[PDB]
Write a protein that holds these residues in place. Structure first.
Motif, PDB file in Angstrom:
ATOM      1  N   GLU A  40       6.299 -10.202   6.559  1.00  0.00           N
ATOM      2  CA  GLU A  40       5.907  -8.795   6.155  1.00  0.00           C
ATOM      3  C   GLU A  40       5.994  -8.567   4.550  1.00  0.00           C
ATOM      4  O   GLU A  40       5.195  -7.679   4.191  1.00  0.00           O
TER       5      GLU A  40
ATOM      6  N   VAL B 154      -7.745  -5.016   2.989  1.00  0.00           N
ATOM      7  CA  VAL B 154      -6.691  -3.997   3.350  1.00  0.00           C
ATOM      8  C   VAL B 154      -6.594  -3.867   4.823  1.00  0.00           C
ATOM      9  O   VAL B 154      -5.445  -3.913   5.361  1.00  0.00           O
TER      10      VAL B 154
ATOM     11  N   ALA C   5      -4.430  -6.943   6.731  1.00  0.00           N
ATOM     12  CA  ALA C   5      -3.192  -6.653   6.517  1.00  0.00           C
ATOM     13  C   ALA C   5      -2.490  -5.825   7.096  1.00  0.00           C
ATOM     14  O   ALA C   5      -1.425  -5.628   7.612  1.00  0.00           O
TER      15      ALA C   5
ATOM     16  N   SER D  41      -0.451  -8.466   0.192  1.00  0.00           N
ATOM     17  CA  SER D  41      -1.667  -8.330   0.459  1.00  0.00           C
ATOM     18  C   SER D  41      -2.298  -7.098   0.387  1.00  0.00           C
ATOM     19  O   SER D  41      -3.237  -6.907  -0.139  1.00  0.00           O
ATOM     20  N   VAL D  42      -1.535  -6.178   1.103  1.00  0.00           N
ATOM     21  CA  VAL D  42      -2.057  -4.816   0.710  1.00  0.00           C
ATOM     22  C   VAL D  42      -2.250  -4.282  -0.628  1.00  0.00           C
ATOM     23  O   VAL D  42      -3.112  -3.635  -0.916  1.00  0.00           O
TER      24      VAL D  42
ATOM     25  N   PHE E 287      10.954  -1.451   2.330  1.00  0.00           N
ATOM     26  CA  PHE E 287      11.033  -2.830   3.098  1.00  0.00           C
ATOM     27  C   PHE E 287      12.270  -3.465   2.198  1.00  0.00           C
ATOM     28  O   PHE E 287      13.256  -4.204   2.909  1.00  0.00           O
TER      29      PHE E 287
ATOM     30  N   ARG F 115       2.628  -9.535   3.856  1.00  0.00           N
ATOM     31  CA  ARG F 115       1.564  -8.495   4.063  1.00  0.00           C
ATOM     32  C   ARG F 115       1.681  -7.295   3.176  1.00  0.00           C
ATOM     33  O   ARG F 115       0.441  -6.984   2.765  1.00  0.00           O
ATOM     34  N   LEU F 116       2.769  -7.000   2.729  1.00  0.00           N
ATOM     35  CA  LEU F 116       2.833  -5.813   1.714  1.00  0.00           C
ATOM     36  C   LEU F 116       2.275  -6.469   0.356  1.00  0.00           C
ATOM     37  O   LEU F 116       1.488  -5.404  -0.019  1.00  0.00           O
TER      38      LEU F 116
ATOM     39  N   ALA G 120      -5.005  -6.057  -2.636  1.00  0.00           N
ATOM     40  CA  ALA G 120      -6.265  -5.665  -2.186  1.00  0.00           C
ATOM     41  C   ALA G 120      -6.438  -3.944  -2.750  1.00  0.00           C
ATOM     42  O   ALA G 120      -7.621  -3.926  -3.340  1.00  0.00           O
TER      43      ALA G 120
ATOM     44  N   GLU H  35       7.700   2.049   6.563  1.00  0.00           N
ATOM     45  CA  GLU H  35       8.030   1.400   5.911  1.00  0.00           C
ATOM     46  C   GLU H  35       8.061   1.594   4.218  1.00  0.00           C
ATOM     47  O   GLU H  35       8.719   1.241   3.688  1.00  0.00           O
TER      48      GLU H  35
ATOM     49  N   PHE I 180       6.471   0.391  -4.158  1.00  0.00           N
ATOM     50  CA  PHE I 180       5.600   0.324  -3.091  1.00  0.00           C
ATOM     51  C   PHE I 180       6.353  -0.210  -1.981  1.00  0.00           C
ATOM     52  O   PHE I 180       6.435   0.364  -0.748  1.00  0.00           O
TER      53      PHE I 180
END
Ligand SMILES: [Ca+2]
Ligand SMILES: [Ca+2]
Ligand SMILES: [Ca+2]
Ligand SMILES: [Ca+2]
Lengths: 73, 72
Positions: free
Chosen positions: A7, B13, B16, A13-14, A69, A10-11, A17, B36, A65
């Motif tokens: 996770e 984006v 993910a 990566s967002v 989490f 994943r965060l 990007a 989250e 951001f």
């Protein structure tokens, strides 16, 4: 352990990007510009940005951001 | 290359955000990410409804990126 690790990955990566200018933060203009490309209107974009930008300096750090989490661990 | 690089960004984006690897952003996983990030649920639902153009409860990549793809 592996789930939270995934996770966080994943965060990042967002975030990465979204960060088209490679500054390591999400500046207001590049955040808006992506929202606009996704056809989200400026009031919605700003609502979400002002929320993420905890310290109101005009750029979202990865700490800000992923505040929610990281605080949940 | 400018456009190609934007496509790659949008694709990154999307990938993910699609945590369950369905090929779509289901409302559940979308909202959970926004929760989250501490985004207000009304702001989250508004952005989800904006992206989910055909109103079926899941965002396809065609839908997500329709502004970019259609401006090409
Ligand atoms: Ca940036
Ligand atoms: Ca900030
Ligand atoms: Ca999915
Ligand atoms: Ca849909």
């Amino acid at each position: 352990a592996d789930g939270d690790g995934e996770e966080l990955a994943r965060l990042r990566s967002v975030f990465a990007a979204c960060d088209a200018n490679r500054s390591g933060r999400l500046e207001r203009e590049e955040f808006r510009a992506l929202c606009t490309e996704l056809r989200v209107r400026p009031a919605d974009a700003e609502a979400v940005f002002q929320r993420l930008d905890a310290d109101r300096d005009g750029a979202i750090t990865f700490q800000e951001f992923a505040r929610g989490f990281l605080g949940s661990l």
